[PDB]
Amino acid sequence: LLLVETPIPQQKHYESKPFPAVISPPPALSLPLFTQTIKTQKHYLDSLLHESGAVLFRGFPVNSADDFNDVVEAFGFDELPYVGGAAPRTSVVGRVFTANESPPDQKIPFHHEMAQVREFPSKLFFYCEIEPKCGGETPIVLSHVVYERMKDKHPEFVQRLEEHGLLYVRVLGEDDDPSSPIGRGWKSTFLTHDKNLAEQRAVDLGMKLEWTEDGGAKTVMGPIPAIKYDESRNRKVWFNSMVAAYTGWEDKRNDPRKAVTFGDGKPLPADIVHDCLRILEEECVAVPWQRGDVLLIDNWAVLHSRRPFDPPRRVLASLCK
Amino acid sequence: AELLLVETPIPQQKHYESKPFPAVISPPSASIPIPALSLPLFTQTIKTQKHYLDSLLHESGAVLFRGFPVNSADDFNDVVEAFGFDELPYTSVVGRVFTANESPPDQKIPFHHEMAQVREFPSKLFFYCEIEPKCGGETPIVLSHVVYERMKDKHPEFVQRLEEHGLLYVRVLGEDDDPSSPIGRGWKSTFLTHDKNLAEQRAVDLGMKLEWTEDGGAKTVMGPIPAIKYDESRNRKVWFNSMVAAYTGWEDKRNDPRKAVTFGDGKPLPADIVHDCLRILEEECVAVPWQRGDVLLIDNWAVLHSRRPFDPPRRVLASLCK
Ligand SMILES: [Fe+3]
Ligand SMILES: [Fe+3]
């Protein structure tokens, strides 16, 4: 067959590079012909991903979870083994999983997948098996651009983060609440029912777990950096969950404003965090999904969100080491 | 090119009234001509042998298909799509195929009838082994009408009080969801709502009284409902309920199984008799070891199923019929 770099409305451009790059089709199209071209075009697709940081594959016959898994499987990358510290995921087939994100009428803030985890995914794929009835887009934005704008806007603020970093406080109940923006419990996060076994995996994950009265838990993480360095492209990125925590970690157990602070305890300037929230919006590209689309996101360069939505909707994913 | 569906015997099968349980079909050894067993030939033979497969499934309660090119979830969906049963109106792997949210391997799943307390339960069910368990993992099955007949013969009075009073099912669920619980789902993720009024309205649509505990939780009561139904296709009574199941497997921090199921009038069931029912179920069951490629078809009106503990890997898919 073949692969074709195609233009779309939403995409943006940076130094003559489309974001995201879009690949579409030009023996009639088949699912085994596609996975076959994926292997045949490995170099081309590694570079395109390197140049753009994400590529949406639209038009190909990926019509099921198993189908998406063949495409994920065809890509070669090794799966990232789960260790705990993320919403309750449900295995579907092979390297592909699902997870009932926060309530459908909410906004999922921008973040890097498992950003506060030691072994975070280098890459990830998103796949739509069920088109959203309304809304429910997976807006994406280039982390390095957000860095070039933050350093430009608030140069002193970045400097404090580069020296002080951030601290995160995330109170977790014993069970999971499907109502909160971040409703995972401690037994679910750490895949443990026992406390010792838990507080142990807690230290291994680099967290300060301290059991709460009502069987809950209050974890503390950091100081940790906010500006990491993607070596493959020699550039720093906004690899932190500042906006996610400050505006998103909001429920009966956590205060948004207290969710995250400077690495040395000093509170963050509200007008600065929300200014960052505004930078993410402006630079983000939210391509409306379609049944069959496959988006390849490099986790070193991209943060992902989720617009609110009205069901039905089914987006599947795959995490790479 | 044609294919022979050959009835075959296996060590684990039983026989009642001369009929095998479960009936087992496989493709012959030396056929004339010799067919190149394929998945597309199998599904065509299933469509062509509809009547024969209706009689076998009709008289045996379940039919295990052994020795067929069912090599992936895609192949399994093609089989289910050849039998012609309507799909049960609504995770999803492909088409009508899906993975069943289960408990840890070391645990044993109690015997039951699929969706036994849901107005529109599956009439028929399919199980498929894509990956045979390293150890155990079998999907034991048992004939519901046999359990009924033996219980009535051993405990006539108790059976008489079962049909007359029925059963009461109690569940004390939290607001949130405990991951480590066989019945961990709380009222939120149960009735898809945060609002207490709507939630209780929905539980009521499901024929159930919903109580609001002061601890932010909820207590639900179902019944009285029969513990014994009548298979019309086979003109016989079936032990269609979840008594033994709930009495032994409905436990966690908020729930005690001993009081999870009682007589429809609130009177507790005799522990000795429930365990005695557990005994009959275990004796009459058939636990055929799973071989990759197998697809088991169960008539949900005549058969209760459960699971054995196992050591992974193990992968089984399923499909439900209206
Ligand atoms: Fe995410
Ligand atoms: Fe079951």
How many whole angstroms from B108 Cα to the centroid of ligand 1? 34
Give the pairing type, strands B6-7 and B23-26. Answer: antiparallel
Q: Terminus-to-terminus CA distance in chain B, angstroms?
A: 33
CB hemisphere CA count around B263 (13 angstroms): 15
CA-based nearest distance A96→chain B, Å: 10
Secondary structure of residue B281 in the 3-state scheme: helix
- Residue B176 CA to residue B185 CA, distance in Å, equals 7
B169 secondary structure, DSSP code: E
How many whole angstroms from B262 Cα to the centroid of ligand 2? 22
- Facing residue for B176 by CB, picked from A64, A90, A173: A173
CB hemisphere CA count around B207 (13 angstroms): 10
Helices (H), chain B: 39-48, 50-60, 73-83, 144-154, 156-165, 187-190, 196-205, 243-249, 271-284
Cβ atoms of B140 and B296 closer than 8 Å: no
CA-based nearest distance B51→chain A, Å: 32
Contact A193 B180 (CB under 8 A): yes
- Residue B278 CA to residue B244 CA, distance in Å, equals 6
Cβ atoms of A297 and A138 closer than 8 Å: no
Q: What residue spans define the domains of chain B?
A: 1-322
Count the Cβ atoms, other than its own, within 10 Å of residue B180: 18
> Is the CATH number of domain A1-321 3.60.130.10?
yes
| Technique used to solve these coordinates | X-ray
- Facing residue for A92 by CB, picked from B74, B99, B177: B99
Residue A282 annotated in ligand binding: no
Q: Which residue of B has its CA nearest to A64?
A: B94
Residue B112 annotated in ligand binding: yes
Residues 6 or more apart whose CB falls under 8 angstroms from that of B313 comprise B131, B133, B134
Residues of B with Cβ-Cβ distance to A193 under 8 angstroms: 180
The angle at the Cα of A67, spanning A64 to A73, to the nearest 5 degrees, equals 145
Q: Say whether residue B67 is in contact with chain A using an 8 A CB cutoff.
A: no
Reduced 3-state DSSP string for chain A: CCCEECCCCCCEEECCEEECEEEECCCCCCHHHHHHHHHHCHHHHHHHHHHHCEEEECCCCCCCHHHHHHHHHHCCCCECCCCCCCCCCEEEECCEEECCCCCCCCCEEEECCCCCCCCCCCEEEEEEEECCCEECCCCEEEHHHHHHHHHHHCHHHHHHHHHHCEEEEEEECCCECCCCCCCCCHHHHCCCCCHHHHHHHHHHCCCCCEECCCCCEEEEEEEECCCEEECCCCEEECCCCHHHHHHHCCECCECHHHHEEECCCCCCCHHHHHHHHHHHHHHCECCCCCCCCEEEEECCCEEEEECCEECCCEEEEEEEC
- Residue B147 CA to residue A91 CA, distance in Å, equals 35
Secondary structure of residue B229 in the 3-state scheme: strand
Ligand nearest to the CA of B127: 2
Q: Say whether residue A90 is in contact with chain B using an 8 A CB cutoff.
A: yes
List C-alpha distances in Å: B204 to A35, B39, B187, B198. Answer: 49, 45, 13, 10
* CATH code, B1-322: 3.60.130.10
CA-based nearest distance B266→chain A, Å: 31
Contact B91 A93 (CB under 8 A): no
How many whole angstroms from B298 Cα to the centroid of ligand 2? 11
B122 secondary structure, DSSP code: -
- Facing residue for A65 by CB, picked from B93, B174, B188: B93
Q: Which residue of B has its CA nearest to A99?
A: B91
b/e burial code for range A66-82 (CB count within 10 A of at least 16 → b): bbbbbbbbbbebeebee
**A 244-283 residues with CB < 8 A to B:** none
Contact B93 A66 (CB under 8 A): yes
* Backbone Cα Rg of chain B: 21
Cβ atoms of B66 and B294 closer than 8 Å: yes
Reduced 3-state DSSP string for B25-74: EECCCCCCCCCCCCHHHHHHHHHHCHHHHHHHHHHHCEEEECCCCCCCHH
Ligand nearest to the CA of B121: 2
Cβ atoms of A108 and A101 closer than 8 Å: yes
Q: Is A217 left (phi over 0), alpha (psi -120 to 50) or beta?
A: beta
Q: What number of C-beta contacts closer than 8 Å exist between A and B?
A: 60
How many whole angstroms from A317 Cα to the centroid of ligand 1? 9
Quick one: how far is CA A170 from the chain centroid?
A: 18
Residue type, A48: L
How many whole angstroms from B97 Cα to the centroid of ligand 2? 15
Secondary structure of residue B162 in the 3-state scheme: helix
